[PDB]
């Protein structure tokens, strides 16, 4: 599709086999989702934002289908304040900023 950006880009996701929302976010370099679980092995990471760093768990090579399109790739999880898919699985879908 092409989005606009008058309100903020929320889609839903599927991952884990559950549905969420998620923000395409061209500011991030990673994926970020609430805390939850996911299956498989994790290694504890630090990202950071405007307000600082915060610890993340880390888990590679997990399925998200994002609007219909599918990506594979690492997913941070982790107390972020809104659940953002990051240039890591934006460029597995093909997106691009457009002007
Ligand atoms: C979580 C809140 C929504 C997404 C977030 C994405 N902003 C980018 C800004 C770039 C850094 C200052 C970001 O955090 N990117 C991170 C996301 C985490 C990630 N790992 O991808 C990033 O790329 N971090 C890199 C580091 C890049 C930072 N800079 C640098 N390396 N020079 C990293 N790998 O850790 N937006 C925001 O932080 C903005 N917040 C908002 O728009 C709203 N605030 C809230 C709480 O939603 C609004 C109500 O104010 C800020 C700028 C104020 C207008």
Same mark, same amino acid.
């Given at each position: 599709?092409? *989005?606009?950006?008058?309100?903020?880009?929320?889609?839903?996701?599927? *991952?884990?086999?559950?549905?969420? @929302?998620?923000?395409?976010?061209?500011?991030?370099?990673?994926?970020?989702? @609430?805390?939850?679980?996911?299956?498989?092995?994790?290694?504890?990471?630090? !990202?950071?934002?405007? $307000?600082?760093?915060?610890?993340?768990?880390?888990?590679?090579?997990? =399925?998200? @289908? !994002?609007? $219909?399109?599918?990506?594979?790739?690492?997913?941070?999880?982790?107390?972020? =304040?809104?659940? *953002? !898919?990051?240039?890591?699985?934006?460029?597995? !879908? $093909?997106?691009?900023?457009?002007?």
């Amino acid at each position: 599709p092409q *989005i606009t950006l008058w309100k903020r880009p929320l889609v839903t996701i599927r *991952i884990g086999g559950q549905l969420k @929302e998620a923000l395409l976010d061209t500011g991030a370099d990673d994926t970020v989702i @609430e805390e939850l679980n996911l299956p498989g092995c994790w290694k504890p990471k630090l !990202i950071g934002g405007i $307000g600082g760093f915060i610890k993340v768990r880390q888990y590679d090579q997990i =399925p998200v @289908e !994002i609007a $219909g399109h599918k990506a594979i790739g690492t997913v941070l999880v982790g107390p972020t =304040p809104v659940n *953002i !898919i990051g240039r890591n699985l934006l460029t597995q !879908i $093909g997106a691009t900023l457009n002007f």
